[PDB]
Nucleic acid binder design. Sequence first.
DNA 1: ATATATATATATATATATATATATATATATATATATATATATATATATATATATATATAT
DNA 2: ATATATATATATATATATATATATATATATATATATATATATATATATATATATATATAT
Lengths: 151, 320, 47
Amino acid sequence: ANRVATLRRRISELERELQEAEAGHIEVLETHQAVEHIRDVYNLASSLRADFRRVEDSWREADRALRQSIIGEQYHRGDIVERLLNDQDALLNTPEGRVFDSFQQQLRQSSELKAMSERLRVILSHPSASDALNRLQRHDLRWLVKRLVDE
Amino acid sequence: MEENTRQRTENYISAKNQHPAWILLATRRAPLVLSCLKTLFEKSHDGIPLEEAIQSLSSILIEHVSQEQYDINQDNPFLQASRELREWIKRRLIVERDGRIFATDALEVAITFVESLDNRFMTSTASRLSTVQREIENLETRLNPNPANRVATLRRRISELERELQEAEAGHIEVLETHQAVEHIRDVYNLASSLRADFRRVEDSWREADRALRQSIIGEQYHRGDIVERLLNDQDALLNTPEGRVFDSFQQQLRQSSELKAMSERLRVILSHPSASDALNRLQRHDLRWLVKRLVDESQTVLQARARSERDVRGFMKTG
Amino acid sequence: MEENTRQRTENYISAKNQHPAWILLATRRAPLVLSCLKTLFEKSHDG
DNA sequence: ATATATATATATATATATATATATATATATATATATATATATATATATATATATATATAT
DNA sequence: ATATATATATATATATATATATATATATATATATATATATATATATATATATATATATAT
């Protein structure tokens, strides 16, 4: 009931915005606020790239721990046969691996990524963006999807 | 210009030799100082009454009696705390104002670095990839003024929402599984807690503008020549473009009390979910619970500071 | 947790001595190293 | 006239030896800087005595 | 009622002790830089062994 009520209020709000738009009450952001919004969206986007280098370290640490445990257990086969029969990856580093895997599941919805890539270029084509972000930042934000997928 | 990189190297050298945050992290006692300062400022809501600060710092020093390697004396923790507070005030990483102590930008940056060393909240997450998607989708609709595009976007989003409503009517709704809820709560805490970051810097910017204005007035042997340009308008003389106007726009959103009323209930409702027990520790739950009031109180303090500075500089262009 | 009040100083003491990032910020040559590395990795994060 | 198995010639690849330059590990010396210790001076707070401003009690 | 003595409110002067502020000098730790020896790596000349290419020669 709460879900349907919230969606019913949201759809009515969108209808009101549509009614205003039909009347011609469009108001785009000035430069003063467009610069701020562009900077904010840049500061959010650039964080997606932050933790790729730590997932690798966590997985390597799990690998070293697993090998040391295997060597230490001089007389136990049950643990290794348990590991091998499991269909899951041997390096279940819960704190980082699972979050990264769920993030990858999102990265593979190419429909959203294409729209995001187009929107990046369109935003960077606006006159205000040249003042909001210097050259290097504009370049970095322009190639975000490519480097995300490559990493 | 490529020489900007060499200029950046010079800037880094200057920051190394002059910035309180980098200065602190290079000393041999930095771990103890940072731990004590964080333990002091962690629980607080708005500054610390100075006397209250002394007692808490002395109690913490007593918690560090076993740490005698840093000269933590048992004879009198009160005197030690009194000495330490002035030691840190002299380093201008904590400041004294209105009978209470605050943490300046340098200490905030240092603590953010230290506590982001190892166990920081993950930013590379599906939740943030949805957040940036939504935000970038929203920004484009407001960057272009074409009416056909706007109406098309609205009349397609209406169809999406209508389909989702029809599906929810059939009962196909679904809630977050425990791990998604944990991740989303962590991401939302990471977003919300960042609003409070820049209050300690707006004040520095306004003080910088005030000092620049006074230096410009005093530096001309004949003040009347320039005072005319300043006093010709009734608006605030602290016209700090870099941060003042951004903060003013942020106020222009804070004063919409309806959003705050909704947020106050929504945050506590979110914290009521069982998964919030695991996603956030007790301290983070406390900080996120009172964040709505904390932002407003901090904004009132900052606005009062600006009012004081503007009034007391207007009392200076006159009589000059 | 409550025991964090005491464990945090040990954690920070270990970090200041072990973590490469905090070691680098403590050396006397840090600014040059940071500027050179930032310039190296400015153009490309792909490796 | 082609396959199929030796034989010979040639080229390639490898091993040995030496010369030259560079990298790494270890040890030591040096310098710098940090932090501390020490010494001195001054500031602040409290206590006690006297002076100035104002009023009341005691003895006859 | 007169005459004497004392007390109350407030400040200033002087002394005592605590504490902070300032400066200097010192010891210490540490970073760092250098030097030495050793090992390692690359290049060139030559000897050695392997492999391939070409041709001869048997059998169909």
